[PDB]
Amino acid sequence: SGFRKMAFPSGKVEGCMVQVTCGTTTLNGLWLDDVVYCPRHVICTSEDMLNPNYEDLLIRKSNHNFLVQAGNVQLRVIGHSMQNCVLKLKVDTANPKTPKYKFVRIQPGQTFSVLACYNGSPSGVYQCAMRPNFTIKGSFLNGSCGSVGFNIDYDCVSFCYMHHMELPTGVHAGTDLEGNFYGPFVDRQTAQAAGTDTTITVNVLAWLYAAVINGDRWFLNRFTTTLNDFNLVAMKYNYEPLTQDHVDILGPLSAQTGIAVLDMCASLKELLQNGMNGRTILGSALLEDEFTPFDVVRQCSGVTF
Amino acid sequence: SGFRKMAFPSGKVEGCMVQVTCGTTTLNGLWLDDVVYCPRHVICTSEDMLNPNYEDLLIRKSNHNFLVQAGNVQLRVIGHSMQNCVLKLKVDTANPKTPKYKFVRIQPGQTFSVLACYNGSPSGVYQCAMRPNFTIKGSFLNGSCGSVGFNIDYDCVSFCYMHHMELPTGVHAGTDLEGNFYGPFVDRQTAQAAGTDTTITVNVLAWLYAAVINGDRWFLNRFTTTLNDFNLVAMKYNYEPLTQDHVDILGPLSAQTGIAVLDMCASLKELLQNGMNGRTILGSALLEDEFTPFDVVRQCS
């Protein structure tokens, strides 16, 4: 019993984190095989950051301008290139702790673990969702750039996020490991803002299924609904649309708990219209949307890595 | 910016997790240097569950009755002893991934990370607090026994919890790494029930300081309180007493934000009276009590 916000074990990724220094800037890099990945903004001064020409800044740098430390050991940088908004430093040694891995780009609604790091040293692990507005609600201080996000699918680490910056509202923006931003952001010091966010409907339903599995049942009711009727309600309350694919994905949980997805949608409709009337679900007074259907099944079934 | 329930990176503990089998029972063990630690209830049978005599069950075992698997490798058990409610299996290999570590017994209100494990393999990491009633609100399935709780301030792992059992209310009980239970619990299937649980007041105050640090002041008020009047009110909402020690511990956060501890207590009193009126604090619609003052300073700097 119990249901907690749970991250993947972080050990396989811890063994890949390094410190990258360029001039007066220190941040984190990811060392896989013989390449260190980090944000390209490491090469900017403050003035450059206002309007950077990355190609022009980079051509002025030599390999020896990049100081890379893996724990207490310097790595030798033997090459440097850029891919979108990530810098790739070729080093002279393959990381002996490189896990089986892939680079994947995730979709809004999908969750991942973030290993927060400072000076190449992991400090904390937590679970995040990619918001519909392509931000994450992380917890990061100065020095955290280059921290990474990941899932583990078997013994394979899927790296999906590298941290680049904090937005004025205190939410976070970054790239996939091929250097493409999530969301309409750029790596420059200019006015940028998170768009208005929405709630991830399919995940709220997953979490209601988690609640039922753990014996929290007060919100269930006799009623069902249609996708179209529910979607009119979702739209009114700034919930993402529920699609038939979402319904299909929740199929297992529906069969296990005896609550059809549209039956659970009628529960959610009532919660949106009426509130919780002083009650909690899994210890929360808000509807939680950072567990995917996969997360719920994994945690309710004890899958290991 | 931001504020998240954040665990320690689990790698140093992952490298210590093994599978322990005795008879038909399999659970997790912790391999440090040449000793594997696990719950002594691994030696109980189905018969034994209510009133096991562990000394009598143990004397009947040989080293070779304990199967210890570290990844794909069997370890050889070369000795065994019981300390309180933990079994210590001496093995013929020192774990080459042993971190710097210590064993610490914690007090209610303290937080730690839990590495949930099944069959000696890590499943997930999350943050927990030792509740005032000496339980933890974990996430554990059958087979999770022997999972551990830890902090890693510095590069040294402080092991503070080993998981033993789930109580009927669905909360969790366990021991320190010297095998002494937290709270009045025993490793028997006899009827036992946790005390009524209460809110960890000092932690809620810490978390209100966190909200201020992160730019939120809506819940402050112009009032102050005496410590005794605060406690008289808070006990009515099932809050733990705040002690002068707790007031002292909040001093740094008070100095950082400019809000006196008893002024923050007055804010909390009003929140208990009023609720949040549709607002949130650090993304929550309830008052959060699983962040310590130390946790807040670590995360917020």
Ligand SMILES: O=C(Nc1cc(C2CCCC2)[nH]n1)c1ccc(F)cc1[N+](=O)[O-]
């Ligand atoms: O974003 C931050 N620092 C930055 C941004 C940039 C540039 C790089 C491209 C555009 C912006 N450089 N350094 C930041 C600030 C405060 C804080 F608490 C946390 C962070 N952080 O990192 O998440």
Ligand SMILES: O=C(Nc1cc(C2CCCC2)[nH]n1)c1ccc(F)cc1[N+](=O)[O-]
């Ligand atoms: O408590 C559980 N299993 C136990 C208890 C014992 C007793 C034998 C005498 C003292 C210990 N053995 N195995 C348990 C059961 C269901 C569940 F979802 C989770 C757990 N758990 O562990 O957290």
Ligand code: NA
């Ligand atoms: Na219903």
